[PDB]
């Protein structure tokens, strides 16, 4: 039986198969012990660890039921289906860019508020996520920070999937503007340029869930984002929020240029919404949820590490279509130039890279360029390229 | 032997395969018996037909002697091996959008110069190539026309070849403009934005040959057209050549305003670089011609129907890079958003489509809409991709 | 004596002068009964009036002991040394520039608001002061009506008069845009362009009385125009006012523009600032107030028939420099091309025109062009030039 | 009689009087020997001193002779009705402001043609005319300099003269473009912003005299130029214009700009029209020349020292409403702001100030600060201003 070949593969010419070494196995492919497929499979190995004082063997009968619980996902593990066959290598790539980033430095840490002139220029770390299931992380993989500016996409994600493209579309342009992100402008009809620049951001967090009040909309958008990470760490930064709707006069002046210029929906507060906008932007992240996040968007809208539809794939394919050509605004041109991926940037250091149909990625490092993106992480993303030959047009 | 398995795969249970089946079976596939590859073959079956007064049958050795020469092309075109296995399918899709497209209608025919209003407001055609081999055509492929705009990614091509990347961006930019292709701006360290708008082309178009006379510059740019296209139809439209250099005001602005800010290399006579310009800009062609030089461009730098090279895969890479997010100008944004290709269009009709690594498409219709794409041409790309799903973020 | 000869001057040939008859050749020459000045006379008239039952002849005593009380304006005036000697005719081109604005008409009322949209487009009245005391009207010169935008060259002076010319343009700028009058950008040093634009008007809203609370702000400011307008009638809009706080959205938007870039003083609550701009922007006045404020602006910084003082020349100087040039905005150029005066224009009907050195003037007419200028009122000042030779640049 | 009256007031209770104290007392008020107003005057002292051996006494007939012919001007010299009674103070005050200006130094002389590398950063002369005839001049008052862009007032001004207002301004615009004076853009209705921009200049010089070669053209102008200088010294610097002919690649561009927008009267040769735009910038003038031009362009249209007509009201008029507004391009609001006078200035050093009614003036300087005005020119206009009370707003 296919169980039995499995147990076979596992062994070297022996009878029984240790419990430590199928996990040690399991986890080299790139999977996590925690994978909520998997979750069934661990707890079987847990009822089997209460028996024993220490230790177990599995030669026929325990292998097998532990391993019935949905067996489709292990075959292709341990017969190198997935689309990164051997994850290690890559990872050795992902250290030895990792280092080469951290071998550079040189920037000026955020201080408009003074949460974001908090951290000590050191901290640099990354993590990907593949489609499948993969994952991988160096250094601050666990420190919280704010998403910024890599929420925008996920704005324009839902509101599209909630609404559709052709309705929302009446409202916010199509094109990338040529200048900078903060720059109050709209396009020939009098419409945002695009949902990436502020302005066509701040148009489009008011179309998602429109009518009822920030609480239920906040509510909504968290319990996408927390389906869109994988049921990971979302969370709030409350100090963040706090100095960022302080320090936010640009972004007002940006609503308020908007609500003049009728580019809202019918019956809209804007002071409301340009609220709703800070809470979003203050979203807590570490690089395994906004990577998570990242690969959700790379998919197919679906998310990597749950099997679950969050998007609809018109809605995802115009957020790609759109973080490709303005994701990292009036430099992308350049980006694309040299990458060739659709990626994000936050002032707050981070940056979320998609590969689609392969991974995400997020990288984070506080101290910024003068265009407003991290070194380290503009490093990384080159060499990476470099190296690795993603870039769109590539052969 | 393998020949004996192509003929008995060709033959039906019988002994002899006439030249007319053979011709008519290659034909099917999508090559054509016009083929260079194929030349010795087809001279090798004159030679067969110069003996027998009509018709002559081929059992063993002659289909094995015939086809001996490169004996490799065909295993792979009667094994369904290459890109696209099945090109009548297809075809017939090309000719339901042609017929949809031909359908609407409603436009203005261009005529700022006579040459351009003297087209009926009637004639649209379509040819593809596939990078492999395959050609199909529909309607007036053999008509001549100017590529006008249509070869500003052929002038970068061969600069970044001859000169190479980092040498040529020294010069020009790397970002979409934002605006029109014929505004008079630069980017912010006084560089023209990209080498598709006017001014961009027009600093490209002068690290061509740098030094020797235009008349050397001309047969250069020339063969390397003629190595491009394939050898093909590549012309000179010098009734047009005399209009437009009479009709280019706004290229004549655009050139004195990049001599002035320094950005041209050194020692150069910028009025005979504008008049080398327009020349370039005159070149005759025809959908065949046009779409072989796309499939170029969408290869690797070589050409499809030759085996031969042509551009560095840096030239390639970065032409497309550039096409992709300045292709159409102003509009890109929204034709990537929709189409998600690289494609060029000229004022005289014709749009060039690029699917890298599939085909590349040439599809020419006069009259012209408010932004200077041709109607027919454009509606026959918005539906290519909702019925094939070439989107560049399809999945 | 000087009082015998204007006694002997009034009369004709005969003893006594009744009391009408001197009224009535007062009134003739321009200045008005109620005049400030003349309080006093006025007052010992009636006393006169109180004793005979109907009719007072003075013949060398009353007579002498009325004009006792400052006898230096009547000498003035009855020997036609006032900058108009003749009033009169005048009066008589204004009531024919007049009727000829009415006999044109056609525009739209604006209707951002309901209280604008309110107002018959019918109403057109006309009033102008001179600096010495005369005064006429025409129409309805007497209906209330919002400033709106006539107030900014008032808020300029009274910031530049309280701080100085150096200081306050430390902080705006001195230039024309070239563009219209809400158009959100700064000039080269991220300064506002000029005090006449919003966003120059909104940064010099916010030097006058800085520090206290919005209350004591306007208190004051209300103070300054009362005694700029005369002691006229200056009032408050308060249904105009909640109506413009309501739909004010590019205000808002230039001001939290101006907050980012700190173009503000130390220490500012930026939204009290805005809110007394509205106020400011919400003072009820008829074209007696309007015109006698002008007249302020015209005279020397001190009000014309009250003889005092109201700003420092340096203020008035400066903001008659910016009325000149950026007075009626993008179409000031053009103005002063044909009309060659400092102009400003409210959307709520209205034109205040200041002859430096001549007089003041107010003309309302609530339906407007598409500019923004009142159809009737920019007739009338074409004609007003083209008959009285006003320009600036005249001979 | 008068003559004896003018006699006896020369005079100081004496007999005769000799001719050289005549010759002083006349230079006195400010008016000059060669004078053409008193040609034949001092032709007729000629003929007294041809035949005394030297010295010759005037005391009844000799003196009414010579004053006979043409006793208008002398009356109110000798009578000081002019409009500047006492030129003397004037001059010193000139002398003043000249030696705090040449105490000041630092610019950068104009290097894009060797020409302009070529005077030493210390000429620096000043001369000053009347409207009345009064001359002055301190310093380099007779070295030679290309007008470069102090001829554009002089191209509109003969436009308008010659065809009119109406029509002229069907081709040009009448606004500040708030830019620099070398930038490519059109008004709303793609016309010129205005004639002192360069665009507006290049357009207006096709509007004189229409369909003639440039042979002609360029006599016609200097014809008008040279009854505008008063007959003075007008040149042509062939080296400069060789120089700037070959350095003018902003004006080309401009001008084909324009040509393709149809900005230009039916039936011109634009490249004739940019070498006469150059031809009429590379005139060479003296600052006596220069000042002459600009009181001609003050008093009336007329000229001063010849009592002669040279343009129409209407032209002049125009032609200072552009200067004002207009003169120093995006500092012009700065420059009125502080000096309140119509002004324009050269690349090669030079300031023309016009104070209407008053005078004309020219002050020369190679060496250039950032904007394009020498450093000493702004100097002393400043220092006049404050020095003087000669703002256009002042009391």
Not at 308 to 331: I, K, Q, W
Not at 367 to 386: A, E, Q, R, T, W
């Amino acid at each position: 039986s296919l169980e039995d070949l499995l147990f076979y593969t596992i062994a070297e010419g022996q009878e029984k198969i240790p419990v430590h070494k199928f996990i040690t196995a399991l986890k080299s492919t790139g999977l996590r012990t925690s994978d909520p497929r998997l979750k069934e499979c661990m707890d079987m190995l847990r009822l089997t660890l209460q028996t024993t004082s220490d230790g177990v063997m599995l030669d026929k009968d325990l292998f097998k039921k532990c391993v019935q619980s949905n067996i489709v996902l292990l075959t292709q593990a341990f017969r190198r289906k997935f689309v990164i066959p051997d994850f290690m290598s890559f990872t050795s790539h992902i250290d030895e860019l990792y280092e080469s980033a951290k071998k550079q430095s040189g920037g000026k840490v955020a201080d408009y508020i003074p949460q974001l002139a908090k951290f000590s220029p050191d901290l640099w770390g990354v993590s990907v996520c593949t489609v499948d299931g993969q994952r991988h992380s160096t250094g601050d993989t666990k420190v919280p920070f704010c998403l910024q500016s890599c929420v925008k996409p996920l704005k324009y994600a839902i509101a599209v999937n909630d609404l559709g493209t052709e309705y929302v579309h009446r409202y916010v342009g199509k094109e990338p503007s040529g200048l900078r992100f903060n720059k109050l402008f709209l396009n020939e009809d009098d419409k945002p340029h695009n949902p990436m620049v502020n302005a066509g951001a701040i148009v489009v967090t008011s179309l998602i869930k429109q009518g009822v009040n920030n609480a239920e909309k906040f509510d909504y958008v968290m319990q996408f984002l927390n389906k869109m990470a994988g049921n990971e760490y979302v969370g709030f930064s409350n100090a963040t929020f706090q100095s960022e709707r302080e320090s936010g006069d640009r972004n007002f002046a940006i609503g308020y240029y908007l609500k003049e210029k009728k580019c809202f929906p019918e019956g809209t507060d804007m002071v409301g919404i340009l609220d709703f906008y800070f809470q979003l932007c203050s979203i807590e992240v570490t690089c395994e949820s906004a990577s998570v996040m990242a690969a959700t968007l790379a998919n197919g809208g679906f998310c990597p590490i749950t099997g679950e539809r969050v998007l609809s794939p018109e809605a995802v394919r115009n957020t790609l279509s759109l973080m490709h050509s303005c994701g990292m605004y009036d430099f992308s041109g350049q980006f694309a130039f040299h990458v060739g991926l659709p990626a994000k940037s936050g002032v707050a250091g981070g940056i979320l890279l998609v590969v689609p149909n392969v991974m995400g990625m997020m990288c984070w490092s506080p101290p910024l360029d003068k265009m407003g993106n991290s070194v380290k992480g503009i490093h990384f993303c080159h060499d990476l390229v470099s190296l690795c030959n993603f870039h769109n047009y590539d052969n």
